Amino acid sequence: DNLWVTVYYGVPVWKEATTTLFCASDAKAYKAEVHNVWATHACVPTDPNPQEIVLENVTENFNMWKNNMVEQMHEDIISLWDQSLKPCVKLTPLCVTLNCIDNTSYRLTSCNTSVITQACPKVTFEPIPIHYCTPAGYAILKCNGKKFNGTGPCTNVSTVQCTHGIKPVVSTQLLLNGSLAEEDIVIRSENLTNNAKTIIVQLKDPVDINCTRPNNNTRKSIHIGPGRAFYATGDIIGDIRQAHCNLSRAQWNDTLSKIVTKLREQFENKTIKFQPPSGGDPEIVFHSFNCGGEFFYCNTTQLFNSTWTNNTEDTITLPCRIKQIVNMWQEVGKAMYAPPIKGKIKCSSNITGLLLTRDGGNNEMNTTEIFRPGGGDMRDNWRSELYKYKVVRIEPLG
């Protein structure tokens, strides 16, 4: 068990610290769930009595895209995927050194393809909310402003000892399970008009999504009689790598109608035109989430086609497809997985955020706004969660 002591009163000079934090999640330590196994060997139980000391008159410049704390979580989830889904073939590139003598030719074609073969057991998979807690001597601040602007200074700074519920869910084009906005859908981006930094859009209302596969692959009709030998029962008849989702159109249309109102105020009365993405990797062109080793690659072309104009006011069939050979977001290379499993898999998920890029240009005339879906950089996935916090070290006179 762990234990830390408070600070009754301290307002000294603040200095940005880069110390090593310890996780703290509510595990179980008995099930065969992987996140319960990982939290048992490296995490501690959650704080039963948290304390948030509110600072009356205190301000600070919370820069968020230069936060070194999200660089630690990104190196703590890569340590979980090497203990959760062991790939059958882990093909990764490996080059060494080839240069000539910038002034001399830079033809580097020496690269080795190292392959690793491991056992592939299909294991359970479900995220668990964790709490990152500060070590001895440091403190974690937290704004309470309902807008917070991204890298802008707030005024309602309060200090804590552990963060809120953070799930390690890995997804693209739609931020899954996590925290919601307070009062209004806000947008966050490091620099607008940059047409390079992704725009994080956080929602204030949870849009639900149900992603399941129908159990009709195996046949239940019996040809009891002349056949019953070749076409015998339990024979696969359907595609075992096909699924479908559904989105409540009457509820999702409200939340998207609030996103375009924020853009109009920000970008001075333009024609918001959403579009499908411009191509690339199948983890970028399509949606990508995980449910028990089932890596749903959901076609979202019937989700971002619609163009917009002013005066704005049921079951969208989202076609998904399970692909075995997937790209690893952790560095370069691929990872071939195992065949899918026997039974109904249901992903009764949430939608809390939205990752959007921007297509600006000067060849195109004065007014257009193209917002293609982006994401894929998993550091940007948890910058949408660790935006309120900051690790600062306060020296003690004692």
Binding site: T113, S221, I222, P226, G227, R228, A232, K334, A338, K342
Partner: protein
């Protein structure tokens, strides 16, 4: 620089802890079944029509036994009229839709179930003739033979009537198949309810008849040997019963094993991969039985082709 991951091929198989590559065994069987089934249909059609011509006009169906022999040949014809369809079903697929599939499936089992039913009636008629000779004479009226047969056909229809509950055919797998889709909500009940009905009515019941009836008949053989023709008449009915058992009881045993691959029997997939080559052979052996009963009549029967037995030797 040279990565070897480029393969679009996939396998239609679930993930288990024992990979079992089960071979379809349809093509090898499709080059053996359509000529065999056609040969069965050739010999069976001209075989049974002769047994219908001879009894109707040469013998005169003057007795209850001849009536059951007629109906047994008719039961074989109901089996025979479906044989060219199954001949053209291993070879390619099911081209006949489904509206006719609720009739053809029924006609298959009407041929099957009534087939053993009249053989049992043949056994009981000969049993009554030997032991209860006073009782048999009162009840072996040809009139009573007809009304017994009419009931026997009705029961044979009802014995296939659960199979006619659903015969819907949809494209599952390579080509449309007509696999009965009985209700899912009580799925475990109906599946076990079908293995027993073939085994009890087709194997257990005629075995129980054979034990009871041929113990009373063999008692006559222990007493005296005065009448050869009484002993020779039992040889016809006895042969029909055992040739039915030689050709159908291997299927009945395997059919129990087909459903019971659980703790009751054997659980290995390789045990079910030899069993995949066992069910079709014993079903094929059963298919050949419909032409054997006229062949028996030309060898055992000393009333139909008795002059051919002297002419052959």
């Amino acid at each position: 620089m040279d990565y070897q991951v480029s393969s679009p091929i996939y396998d239609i198989n679930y993930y288990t802890s024992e990979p079992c590559q089960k071979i379809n065994v349809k093509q090898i069987a499709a080059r053996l079944l359509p000529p065999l089934y056609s040969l069965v249909f050739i010999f069976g059609f001209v075989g049974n029509m002769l047994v219908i011509l001879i009894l109707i006009n040469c013998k005169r169906l003057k007795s209850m036994t001849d009536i059951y022999l007629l109906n047994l040949a008719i039961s074989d014809l109901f089996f025979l009229l479906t044989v060219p369809f199954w001949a053209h079903y291993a070879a390619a697929q099911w081209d006949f839709g489904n509206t006719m599939c609720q009739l053809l499936t029924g006609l298959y089992f009407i041929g099957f179930f009534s087939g053993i039913f009249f053989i049992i009636l043949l056994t009981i008629d000969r049993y009554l003739a030997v032991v209860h000779a006073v009782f048999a004479l009162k009840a072996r009226t040809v009139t009573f033979g007809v009304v017994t047969s009419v009931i026997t056909w009705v029961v044979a229809v009802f014995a296939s009537l659960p199979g006619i509950i659903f015969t819907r055919s949809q494209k599952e797998g390579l080509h449309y198949t007509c696999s009965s889709h009985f209700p899912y909500s009580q799925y475990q009940f109906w599946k076990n309810f079908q293995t027993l009905k073939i085994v009890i009515l087709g194997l257990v019941l005629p075995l129980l008849v054979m034990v009871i009836c041929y113990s009373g008949i063999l008692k006559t053989l222990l007493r005296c040997r005065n009448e050869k023709k009484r002993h020779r008449a039992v040889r016809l009915i006895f042969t029909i019963m055992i040739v039915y058992f030689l050709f159908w009881a291997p299927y009945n045993i395997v059919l129990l094993l087909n459903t019971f691959q659980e703790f009751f029997g054997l659980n290995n997939c390789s045990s079910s991969n030899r069993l995949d080559q066992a069910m079709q052979v014993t079903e094929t052996l059963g298919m050949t039985h419909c032409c054997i009963n006229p062949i028996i009549y030309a060898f055992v029967g000393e009333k139909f082709r008795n002059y051919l037995l002297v002419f052959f030797q």
